Amino acid sequence: VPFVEDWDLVQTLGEGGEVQLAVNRVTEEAVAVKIVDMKENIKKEICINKMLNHENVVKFYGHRREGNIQYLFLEYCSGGELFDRIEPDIGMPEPDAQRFFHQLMAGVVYLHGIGITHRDIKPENLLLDERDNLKISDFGLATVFRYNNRERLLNKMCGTLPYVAPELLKRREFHAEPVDVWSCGIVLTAMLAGELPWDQPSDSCQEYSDWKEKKTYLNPWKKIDSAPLALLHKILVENPSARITIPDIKKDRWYNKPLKKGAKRPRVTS
Ligand SMILES: O=C(O)Cc1ccc2c(c1)NC(=O)c1ccc(Cl)cc1N2
């Protein structure tokens, strides 16, 4: 079949390598093409992506090298970013946030199960497909924390300051999994309050001190109902050894609270 290998680049999706929306010449199938001018970092991204296969992880179709430029063929998520579903100082309806949080946990359970830590979980990196299914995106900062059933402790500073766990700023070494759990908690906070609680999780940050002192009558905590707030009290624990794990997040009362109706299906009467 001539021309199935040809894709037209029709619009920019994101920057930081650059990603463009590509449309197949014959089939009109939409894919995301990450264009990286290597001019090692992308080599690790391709190889971590080759290990991944999950409905809540951006699909990797392959890669092609044309000299100094790498082309990564990735799943196009038409719904855009979770960031744009968050209304400033408001958030989103609690049943929507619960559904997105369920899909975020399935994705993170998957990655941790194969020994992969994302290390930069934030709403900008959580993409939505045509049915608003959440997909974990960008494995550029991702790494292996478990190999041959042996855990390797991390020491490298990675992520985005409002989403990083406090042990990354206080300790030389730390476990990978509680770090991803913490960032998921900050994502949950943003979805339910439309604001970030602190610039960074340090004692020098008044908002972080107020949280450890349990001043929940202050924003963003005042905008959040008692049931998801009780979960955030278990996730946003300073000591990573005392912080709730994903198996226990899945047993939480709000996590299991019936809230959202299934996608509106066409129906007629009489
Ligand atoms: O087509 C559109 O404009 C909607 C849209 C907007 C932003 C994104 C996507 C889709 N989908 C995406 O898959 C996407 C891919 C890479 C990057 Cl860096 C950002 C993305 N976000």
UniProtKB/Swiss-Prot annotation:
This is Serine/threonine-protein kinase Chk1. The modification Phosphoserine is found at S270. It comes from Homo sapiens. It is linked to Oocyte/zygote/embryo maturation arrest 21: An autosomal dominant, female infertility disorder characterized by zygote development arrest due to failure of pronuclei fusion. Its main location: nucleus. The chain holds residues 3 to 280 of 476 of the full protein. The gene is CHEK1. Its EC number is 2.7.11.1. The lineage of its organism: Eukaryota, Metazoa, Chordata, Craniata, Vertebrata. There is a cross-link at K122 (Glycyl lysine isopeptide (Lys-Gly) (interchain with G-Cter in ubiquitin)). It is found in: Nucleus; Chromosome; Cytoplasm; Cytoplasm, Cytoskeleton, Microtubule organizing center, Centrosome.
